[PDB]
Symmetry: C2
Subunit: 222 residues, 2 copies
């Protein structure tokens, strides 16, 4: 599988790096005094300005399967994105937005996915006044350390599930996996209606025990 490029160094990219152990990752960042922490976290380090195209080419963005961008300001992030788009117009770009008003400029510049940590945080804060169950849920399921995992399971060509409505699929009853969504391309249907019918290519977004996930994979197999 192809390498990932991470542009910029933050607490966010540190956590990303920790989740990307095993994959080949290149971190392109200005601050030299982090080289040791990047290598110790299982990534290659490339000193450079991620807003300069010359430096982006040092990280081989053309041959990257995705680029992750989180620079100190949204203005710097935007320039980085624009730099990437000058080299590879198609490569997948994930970017972090520091400010809500700047999200649309990030998509405009060419980001395929924008994450807004402070918007997520602020909304979780408001749902946490009485008890923190929602914040607990989000923080628990994303952590590949807990008993429940959030998974994306693709429906293979020729699946036993082609043309079967989610009601007929009865996935939670059969496999133990909760279906929270169905996605295809850039669209996600959360809590699909009973009458939606699966196609090969659809991605099931689910939550389950490790054992339940494997059951779902076998259930939807050809």
């Amino acid at each position: 599988s192809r390498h990932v490029v991470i542009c910029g160094w933050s607490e966010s990219t540190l956590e990303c790096l920790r989740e990307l152990r095993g994959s080949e990752v290149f971190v392109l960042a200005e601050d030299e005094n982090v080289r040791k922490k990047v290598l110790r976290s299982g990534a290659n380090f490339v000193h450079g300005d991620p807003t300069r195209v010359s430096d982006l080419e040092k990280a081989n963005v053309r041959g990257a399967r995705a680029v992750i961008v989180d620079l100190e300001s949204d203005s710097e992030t935007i320039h980085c994105i624009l730099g990437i788009r000058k080299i590879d117009e198609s490569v997948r770009i994930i970017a972090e937005a520091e400010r809500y008003e700047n999200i649309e400029q990030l998509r405009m510049a060419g980001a395929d996915q924008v994450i807004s940590p402070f918007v997520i945080s602020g909304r979780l804060m408001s749902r946490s006044i009485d008890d923190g169950y929602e914040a607990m849920f989000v923080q628990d399921v994303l952590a590949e350390e807990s008993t429940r995992r959030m998974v994306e399971v693709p429906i293979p060509e020729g699946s036993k599930l082609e043309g079967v409505s989610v009601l007929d699929a009865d996935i939670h009853d059969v496999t133990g996996v909760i279906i929270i969504g169905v996605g295809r391309g850039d669209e996600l249907i959360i809590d699909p209606p009973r009458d939606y019918s699966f196609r090969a290519g659809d991605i099931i977004l689910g939550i389950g025990k490790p054992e339940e996930i494997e059951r779902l994979k076998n259930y939807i197999s050809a």
Copy 2:
């Protein structure tokens, strides 16, 4: 209901403020020049250093139902929490952690809940390499803009659901609401097993359309 206190002014507490319109909110922050923006967002403003116990008392932390803390550094944040605990040992405290290494210290200092935007973000980024469904899910369900809402529904005393296993309740089947979890006290069970039995007081964590939500509400309602 009692007021909420927010300590600090950041992109997080701004976004928090937007979700708390209608509620009584007090924002305590050092920079006087954010008053207009705070008042314009439906909160009262209290100029002061949230790390000083005296300034916290201006914000009436004692009678607050929760205090939200997000200061520029974790070091300041901890001091704010320590001050709050000097005033009220029981009040619910929600805090934002800026750095991973500091999370256990915020709890240590007295935070009832710590939210870590950078851990959530870094995890969502790493899950977005192939496709962004998880990020789409987390960000869609929190934005009150779609047809689906994530709700916390309490199980009332005398519910038809007291003592009933989740398998027998079959809540999603009856109401359309996906149950993602059950919570009580400080514990949350995600994707509860078939054999878990509901108690009065448990909080059902779910996702559904408003029509489904209302079905769930009547479904868990009391026996008579």
